[PDB]
Amino acid sequence: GSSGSSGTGEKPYKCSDCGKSFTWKSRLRIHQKCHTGERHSGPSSG
C-alpha cells in the first residue's frame, strides 16, 4: 500500500521523516504527528 501524490514546485516545507512536500506549514505539523499513533488508520487517501 504505497501512495504517490506529487504536485509541482519546490515547497518551503518538507517532512524530514518520510519525504513528502507540503504547501502549507500547518498541514505539515499535522502530518508529522500523524506518523505516530495507530488508531484505525493505515492507508492514505492521496
Where does this chain bind Zn ion (CB under 5 A)?
A: 15, 17-18
Distance CA 4, CA 40 (A): 21
Q: How far is the CB of 41 from Zn ion (least distance, A)?
A: 14
Nearest to Zn ion of 9, 34 (CB atom) = 34
Nearest-approach distance from CB 18 to Zn ion, in angstroms? 3
Dihedral, CA of residue 33, residue 2, residue 27 and residue 12, to nearest 10 = 110
Residue with Cβ nearer Zn ion (9 or 35): 35
H or E element at residue 25:
helix 25-35
